[PDB]
Structure formats: C-alpha cells, structure tokens
C-alpha cells in the first residue's frame, strides 16, 4: 500500500523527468550523408522553414537587424515586446521592407521576409496585436510565462477568430500534456514548450516550479501530434546536440535564445572593456515572468547557424534520418550519472 | 498508459546504458594465481593473440615502429590510413621486413610479424585495399565512424569474397545489436564496437549521438557470439580495470588508442617545452568522423603494456578465470552514484 | 685609481642607461592648447609626416592594407621583407595605386600614397631593392638587427649612390653614437635606433646584449643632429607617454610595432577561439635577428592612432611645445625606484 | 663633455626626483609630548587653520555636507566646480548659513564657517567667480591641471585686482620653482603644488608628464618662502606619515582627496553590494584634466581626521617640533629600494 | 669627513657590487658572423678548450658519464670528491679509458680525454690527490668554500711542488683581489671565482657573506691578468647571456653547475613521479660550505651545450669579437631598476 517514495497517493510524484543530459541518440541504419540531409521543418501549420531555428523574442536577442539576419539564414526572428507599440510596429516594417547571397531566405508570396512578434495579455495587448497585424506581421506569439491560464486561452481564441486568415497564432509556454491540449483546443497553430527548463533557472530556485525539457516535449507532442500542431522546443538548449535531441523528441522547431544573445546582429553597442569585447545597453506586465521574481561578444550569426546546422546534419546522418519528420522517430538511450563526468 | 519518462511509446527510450564506471567485477570461486593466467584471446576467427591489446589505427598512435613494438609485445598494431597509399604499403612492408627477447611475438606461417591496415569506403578505398593486400598485409579494417551504412557492408562483402583466403576483414564501429548482426551477415571476421563511447566525446556534445560502452558490448555480443565472431572493444578505456570489464562483458580484444598516443613508439619527435617533454609533428575523408565536427610524453610502451597485463591478470585471479573465454562469463555488480565520488 | 664597481679600468662600465620608465617630462611655461599643436615631423631629410608614427615592417604588422591605413592616418607604413621579391613589389604597387575622409594623407607630388619597404644585405637584397625601386617605392629600409657591420654600411652607400635622388635610404638599428655617425657618413637619410630595448627582450636573455632606449636615442641624436639626419626610435614603446618621451629625447619619429600587431588592418583572418578573438595565418636570412636566438585582437587602427596622438598632444600642451622641434628641447626628471611601485 | 646618462647636455635630465617613499623623517632633540603639539598652520597669508587639511574639490569628494564637516573638524573644504554656477553658489550659501562639540571650528569675522570654491579659466569662469564672491565665499581656487599657462596667471591677476580685499586667491597646480615664482609674481596668496604625483597617475602613463612630490614641494617652497606665500601639497598622500613628510618639506597645508573620498560626508548614497558597502552617484573645460585622457565606504570623517592628526602629532613629537613652523625645518634621510620590500 | 652612508670611516663600505642583472653588453663595430666565431679559450695556462664550459664537480652534476659527455662536447668535466678515494680514482680511470661523431673532444698528448678531479684540505686530501695523479687525472681542484685561508695556500703550494709538471693545480673560490693575488703567488694555474654568488644563496642569508659576481670577476681579473693566470667564473649563471657577460668581464671559462644538474648524463636514475620526469638519488669536511650552514629532467646535454654556444656566438657577433680574448675587452652598460620589470 505505501508508496516507495512516501505517502499513500501514488500520483503525488507524477513522473520521472528527463533533461537533455539524460539521453543520447542511438545510431540506426543510415543511407544519408550530412551534406544532403533536408533540415526543413514546419514552424506552424502553414509555414515551413529551411532551418528549424527561431530567435527567442528577448530584448537582448531579437530586434529588426537580428530578425532580418535570422530570416535570411533560413529560420525566423520573433521581435520582442519590451517596447512601445509604435516602436515594435516600426521594427516589423523595417524587417518587412527588404539573391545568390541568401538563397535560403524564408519569404511569403509577395517575396518579403517573414517575421513574428510577441504580444502579451490584455486590452493593450489586443491593440498592440492589431497594430502589428496591420503593420504586416506574419506570426503572433502570445508570450506568457504560464499559458495554462484562462486569460491566455481566451486571447489566443480571440486572435485566431479575428485575424486568423491573415496571421498565425502560437500559444505560450506550457510543459504538460493537458496544457498543450488546452492550447490546441483554443485554436493555436503552434505550441511553445518549456517552463523553467534550465538546471538552475530562477523559476526553479525562487518558485520551486519547473519541468525537465525532454519529458515536457514528449508530453506536449503526445497531445499536439494527432492534430497536426507543431511543437516548438524553447529554453534549456546549450549545444547542437541538444537541438538534435529536442527535434528527435518530437519538436518541430527550436527557439535558440542564449546562443544568439551575444552575436553581432543582436541588439546593443559594441565596446571594449579590459581588452575584451562586450555589448552594452514598464511593458513587462507578466506577473509570473522570471524578472518579476528576482553581454560578451560571440561573433557573426552566420558561423553560429552554420555550426548548429552542421551538428544537426551529423545527428541526422548518424540516425539515418533524411528529413526532420524521420528524425522525430529516432530512439533514445538513457545514461546514468557516470556518463556525465 | 503513460510512460514514467513521458510520452506514450514505451520504446522511445530504448534502454538504460551502462558505462565502465557503473559496473564492477564480482569476486568468485578462484583457484588461479595471476602469474599462470592464460591471457590468450581471439582477434579474428583465424587469428589468436597472446596479449589481447591492439593499437587503434590513429595517426598519432600507430606507424611501422608502433606496429612492430605491439606485435613483439604479444598483440598487434593496425596502421592508420591518413597517408598516401604508397606510404601505407611501404609501412606494411617495413613491418613485414623484420627470440629470447620477444618470445610472445605474433607471427604468420612464415614467421613474419603480423600487421593490420585500415581502409575506407569507395573505389579509392578498393585500390588502397588491393595495394595493401599485395604488400602482404594480414588484417584489413574497414574503419568507419558509423558502420551500419549499406556501402560499408557492400565494401566488407566485396573484400571478404575477393581476398577471403588471403586476409581477414573486420567491420567498422557499431553500437547496437542490429548493426553487429548486419556486419556478421556481411561476412566480417570480427566486429569493432563503439560510437562516442567517451563521457565528453565530441560526438555526444555536437551531434548528440552516443552509446555507453558496456551496454553496446553486451548488445553486439548478443549478436556475434552465436556465430563465433570475435568482438573488439574500441574507445572509452582509461585503466586496466576498464580493459578487464570490457573483456568480461563479452569482448575478445581491447583496442587501446589514447593509452599509447604519448608513448615513445608512437609517431612524433620528442622535444622539451617549459621543462616537460612533448611530441611534435586529403585522406581523412570520413563524412561522420569526429574531425569533421570539431601530445605529451608517456614513456616506453613496455611498461604500459606490462601494467595493463598485470591488471588483467589480477582481475582474472579475482574472478577465478583461467582463460579469457572464462573471464567472459564473469558477473557484474552495479554501483550507484555515491560509489563514484 | 680603483673603480668603485671593480677593476682598474674606469671605462669598463661605459655609462648608466635610462629607459622609458626612468624619466618623466617636466612641465614648463606653456601657451599651447593640445588641440592646436602641430605634430608634424621629419621622417627623413626630405619627407615630412603629419603624424610621427611609422609601422615596424614586421610580418605580422604591415602589409598593403596596413600600409594604406597608415598612410591615410597621417603616417607611413613599411612593408615587411619576409616575402618573395615579386610579392613585395606587388604589395608596393598595390599601395601606390590608389578627400574629407583622409585630409591627413601622406602623398607625393603625384597624389599617390607613400610606402616603404625593408631590404636585407647581399646580391639577393640588391636585386630586391632594385625591383622595389622599379615598382615606385619611396623609402628603402635596410632592416638589420645590427647596423654597425661593414656590409650594412656598404649596402647603404651603394643604394644612396644608385637611387639616391629617387628614393630615401634608411640605416638599420643602432644603439651608440659611433654607429650613428658611421651610418650618417655612409649616406643614410635617416637613422633607426634600438637594439634589445625591451626589459625582457630575447637579445638580453640569450645574447646578453642590449641598450636602454632613452640613452640610445640621446647618444644617436648627439651624432645625427649636427647633420640634420632624423632619428627613428624603434622598439620599447608601450604607451603614448613612451612616444612623448622618445620624441622629447631627440627622435623625430617613433616606430610602433607591437602596438599594431593585433589591430584590424594587420594581416591575418579574424577568428574565434575559446570565446576570444585571435588572428590566423627562407627569407629570414638575418644572422643576428631575434628569431635565430629563440596574435590576439586589438580593434581598429583609427582608435589606436587617436589615443596615441591625444597622448602626444597632451604632452605637448604640458611642456609648452607648439611643434615637435620644440618638444625635442624639453627636459627630463629622473625618478627613483619608489616611483614605479 | 659626455654626460653619464647620454648626450652632451648635462641639463637634459634636470634633476633627480624624490617621492614620499624615498625619504623618512630623522629623529632629533625633542621635549614635546604629542598631546601638546600645535598643529595650526597658515592656509593663506590671511587665513590660519587649526588642522592643516583641505578637501580636494572633486565631484566625488567635496560638497556642502563635506565642506561643513571639514570646517567643523578644524580644516576647510573646497567646493568642486562640476556644477552650474547657481548650484555652487547655493552650496556656498548653505555652508555659510550655519560649542563644546566642535572647539576647533574655523570661522570668519562674522562667526560663520569658512568655505572655498574652485573656478576654471575663461569668461564663464569669471562670471562664476563673481557669483560665488557674491555668495559669500572666502577662498577662490583657480583649479587647473597646469598653472604655468599665461591665461591662468592673467585670471589670477584679474581676480586679485577685483576681489583682493575680500577673498583670497590660490594659484593652480605647479611642479617647478619657475611656475611658483610666476604665480607669486601674478599676486597669488597661496600656491598649490603637484602635477601627476601618483605612481600610476594617468598623466604619467598617457602624457609622460609628471614630477615627484617631495622634490616639487621643495622647489616650490624655495620660491614661495622668501615672499611669505604658503604652499599646499595636493595628491600622492596615502597615510599620515605622507602628510607629515609633505609638511616637513616646507608645505603649510595638505590636500587629502582620496583619503576623504570614502567617508560618509562625501557625496553618494551608501548601499550594500556583494557583502561590502559602496557609494552610488559641459563645465569640464580644463584642457589638460585627467578625464580628457582616460566608491567604497570608510566611515565618519571625524575618526579619519583624528587618525591623521594623531600621526602628525606623533611625527612632531619624534622630530621635536613644537609648531608646524618648526616641523618645516626637519631633516630627511633617503632610503634605498631595499627598505621598501 | 662624515660618510654619506654613516660613520667616519670611508672604507667601511668597500665598493658597490654589480651582479649579472645589472649590466648589459654594448653593441660595437662588428665584422664577425656567429657561425665563424672562435669560442676557444684557456682553461689553465697549459690547457685550451674549444668550448669554455666546465661542470661544477658536484655530486649531482659530474660523474664519469657526465665527464665523458662534457669532454666530447669540447669542454671538460671535473669529478666530485664526495666519494671514497678508490671510487673517485676508478671513475677517473673510466673517463681516461676511452671520430667524426665528436670532432671537438678535448684530448691530451696521447689522444685520451681530459678529466678533472676536486680535492679538499688535509692529509686525506693529500693521499686522495696522490691517488688521482697516479690514476692519470689532468687537473686538480682545491675545492674550498673560502680559499684565502693559509691551509688552502699551503695545499696548493705542496701540489704545485710535487706534481707541477704532470698536472695543473687550480685554487678554490675567491671573491677579492687580495685572495686572487695570494693564490697566484701560491702557484695556481687558474683561479676559481665566487663566494655566495646566488641572489638568495644560503651563504648570504645564514652567514651574511657574499660578493656580486661581476665585481668579483673584475677584481680577480685585475690581479690574475698581468701574470697570465686564467679566471674561472663559478656560480650565478642562469642563461647564456650570463655566460657571455662573465666572459666579457675578464673570465676565461665558466663553470656551469645547476644548468647541467638535470640533464641525461648527470647522476641519478630517471623515473616518473605524478606523470612528471625526475631523477633519483663523512667526506664533506668543508666547515664553511653551504652544507654545514643549512631533480627535474632537462634532456640531453648536447642541446644544452648547443644553445649556450649559440648564445655565446650571438654575443660575440654583436660585440664584434672574433675570439674570446677580444670578447674580454667588451664594455658594459649599467641598467637601473626599471630594466628588470
């Protein structure tokens, strides 16, 4: 009768959570060379990217220059919302208002670059979303720290019903199967996954709330896959191997973030301190955001994207996956604590 | 229905992988003293060694001098292939052109020292293999980073059918049971095991692909033992205890590699920098090699081989194994994380 | 009769040597503001630079790009001679074949940029010098580690007699009054000063030969001033104050070297290693060069030249010198050991 | 004829310079107990302080609070001029608009506290000086980096002629006898001494200009003493022994600066960062100021002044000087570099 | 009359001593290429070496193997006396009982190698000296810590009287002109110079006795040069520059010691400790030796001697010295404290 970990309720400890360091990709029968692997993936139900990488809509990562650089590399940039509405709309216009140099560009029918923007929850969020839609945006991200709230679902449904034909809607951060199912029922075209995914993230330390990323992705995919809704792996990524693992768990796209924070195309001013290069620099109304609880130079973005895509191509070659849809069926091997030393 | 680690498919996480640090050899009834232990082992179905150790065909490890020294010590050296075909054939001939000093020498019917050579995949690989066979090479290694490819199996089958009576063919690196079975069916005389076997290997960090070595050896043995095909452990070894564990898990020979890189017989000139000695110095076309993703001094080879043999003999004495074929029937005990600190 | 430092020879220890850290510039009666001081100086008896800074003709410092940048900044670059003769002549032509962006450009009668080139000693050196002169070069530097040799003086005399009217000949490194007088008599248009001027230079540690830079400049100037020959202070500089002291000691132009090794315009590709920027890359026939005895990033060159010129202008304002020819009449104060701690 | 340090001019290195670390005070015949020593000394020819310490007129050191505290403790504060004229005049008024707690207070004829204000050079400097005179200031400091400029002397003469009968005029920073003589000829009532007195002062590193403080004070006193003009030592002081040495070289008052920066009476709000206490915070027209080239907490001001006065009293007792006028005749002993380790 | 450094006797502080770090060799007129520099020098009045280097007769430096290696390299080794007399005589015979490989070997009339041996003071020293002479030794060293004693002079006179024709006698360590003159009068064929020449030598710390090496050499040469007696510099050498400086001050041969302690030919067995290379190891009657007051690996001796000779040749080329006799006329420049940072 007693549970081995204590108590009488077997469901008090729901499940054992796996992170990126707990699993490795098993080699399989392969007829694919890395140079010919097709790394194209679905961002939403209507948009296909050439490189499954998306910027993280942070104020230190994505602006108009970063969005253009990401869109020309085959991915997409999502503009942050720590700005006045007019500033974000102007950044959207700057991205939109722009070929052997960048054949891999992601473009709509009109030939303009694709860009997304983040909107919060509320009436100001509604007017900001409408202004961004009229400015020519393509994807609307409902950037929330916890997307299982009723207000977030109401906003997602309202956006999908009002401007559903013009633009796509992406749900906020979730980490369970039930939350992903709720977002799918609300009408979202894509689901962003991750709630305190880092090992020592501030959400885990201060609030004591978190979810290991591999298990969270597998749970969200278990709810999103039958309906054709893509899953975006957000947070916790540290290497190209982590990106390959996230894509192999069922996610269709990876939101990079800290990898692109210190690149040249990121916002900030380049200065020299102690012989080392650095980048120097009200609307964050989210109650559960991390900043409500509590940069070094990395070079050009092209080399970073090249390294990440090379690692992903190597993983595809090892696992015998010619497409991302075939990489999503790859198997894992769980490693013990001795495998991390 | 829910899996304890997330998702619905119980085969998404195939198995838990054990490394060399997760297991220890259990003592058993013993009547064997370390000095009379029989350390002879099979390298292939037609070749038997006196010390089950082989150099790992790396450009910093094995050349003609290293091959001669390793064959005179009771094992065998495998010449690397980062060289023009003429140079590799010349080194093969130099090894062939050579008793109280070296009683344990491994020799063919003519009394000449045994040597192996690594080849690649393709038509250039075919002409290199034919040139090496003409020069009197004894073992051909189809050395690939991921040997479960179809072209690798075709190359192995062609070599086995053409020069089956002349030389023995050994398949590339594998990590699963299916790959080992495929290599056995292809006609290989021995199977080399290991894909990213190190804890911080570059294959794991960049590509996210790997396999713990103990589990990989147990899986490849489960496919190779019914046909009598020897299994060669490759990579992940750090001590003589790791060699004993690999031989007890089912492998018939351990491939040393980094344990011999800094020794005197390895290629490189001995120089002095900052008061310590160091060693100073087109054909690396493997698509999945670790080089595509990304040496100090160690003293004489004789002391290293003597220490490894002493450790193996101590393990044989502890486990009551008179021969390696009995050491392969030993039992493991699995230790927790606290046993590593 | 006995000398306090030992022996009976009062001239055994010739003199005490002062370095850049031993002296400071004394403030004097001033009516000069830093921003209106004239930093023009004579590089040779016929060439006048706008900023008295010249690159040091090292293989990691000055090539065509660096020479163009230096000539546009107001000084002059000297091309290194670690190249085949044809390549050096091609770089000379590249610099020669080229205004509110660069008002301070150093240009000849034809409006083309000035460039210098280094030559050695010998028949190969003679043919290299003739090839460079045929390419339109302006200043020929006899780059030798010790210019008091007879061969260097003979080469200088030959060049002055052959192409004296077209180009200017500059003698090699000297550190005494006698060598400076010998170079002046041989026919040099400018005398370069410094032999192991650094504190831990390889010449001092290995060969035991050296000369502090302030004393060396004062001695060479005592020989070169009566004949109007400018003195080029080469080596030992680490700050703009060092440049100010060198110009106040009597030198007319400073040769920079290590301060420009890792700048943008120096040769080499800008690469990233370990999260930090670095630069990636038969003719070293000098018998007495430092090479026979035994780079990181710095930023754009414009900021370096701005900082150095600002330091020199501040020094000119402090000492009350409206011209470099007036700065050469400044006085020093010698500081003790406690002034360095 | 040749000079031992190089050249033929014996006055190129004018003199050897001594800092505070190069000298120590020699004990002499004494009959003065520390508790009865008189520490009163002239600040100007008309104002006599009871404690010979003055704050250094910097934006991080002296404001109205600091000036009031210094005047209460027995010295005087000089208000910095990095302010609009109205703000500085208001601070002067605040200090003026203000007894067994502060027996040593320095007061004017009307019984108000004494305060000084620093002015620059120019017409704006003239209007600022006149506005501060109308505010009730007592001492006008012509704060410059190099006071041998003609404009500084002209400004001093103008101020002396205009407001001579009301307030006192103090000349800027000097480091030579000639500059002090020029200031005295201009009509200054006190001469401030020091041009880059620190070992690692930015003026020495960037401009190469400086003068050791002991020699500078001895030279300026050699000119100011025959005319009865006091000498103020500014910069380079780090202990009470340094204050004693400065006063013994002939100076009548020491300007502290960094020794008063970390006190609570200095501007800046006190907070706690990383377990340690710290302080938080157009008119900079001085062409040679340090800011044109390129804080911790220490407690109450009274304890710092007590410690410094105790050290000075101990020095007076050791040297047998009943008054400061007797301490200024004390002798020094010069120590070698071996006494600093 | 009062001395600047205290007292009334001007001869209390005899002289200012210079070490190797206080002087540098001034460049002079040169016509010597380092490849043709003649490094031949006198060891005694009847022995001329081809390389002026001698081992220091310490138990950790020189034995039979080291002596043979040094004699074949162009110099000479001196066997240490920390052994039984029979063992030392046997080692002398071993060296004696022995050519394109070693063209520069130092040889006697019969063509055998030259060796040296050290003796103490006393009757045991006399019997040891007689045994060594009967064993064919060529040079006898009266190895004492202080050679101005009457016993040392008596021993030298006795040896020169008894075996003057067959072998040469060398006096112990001296550091003054008077001691050198006394040894020369006693009849020594060479004078060894240095009494606590190290910077932190145990003699300087425990006994407080020592003399800087450059001054000591200049003083001993002042007494030895008129009579044609060579001077040997002992101790204090750390680099080839120090060797060049010692030979320039007037010494004819340098005794290496610590530079040859960790080589291959020095006594001590080669082993590995913590992954690092190391060496493993009643007659000490010297009362004033450092022993009464109180190794790592270096590689083959050939490279060490080659580097030292290369540095010496570089110094000879810089100073224009065709021979060592001409190098002894070179001049020094004295550097201040700032020349060592």
Author numbering:
A (entry chain E), B (entry chain F), C (entry chain A), D (entry chain D), E (entry chain B): 12 to 109, 223 to 405, 428 to 440, 448 to 494
The article reads:
Central to the purine metabolic pathway is inosine-5′-monophosphate dehydrogenase (IMPDH; EC 1.1.1.205), a rate-limiting enzyme catalyzing the NAD+-dependent oxidation of inosine-5′-monophosphate (IMP) to xanthosine 5′-monophosphate (XMP).
The IMP molecule was only partially present, represented by weak densities observed for its phosphate and sugar moieties. In all our compressed structures, the Cys-loop, containing the catalytic Cys325 residue, adopted the inactive open conformation, but in the extended form, the active closed conformation prevailed, correlating with the presence of IMP.
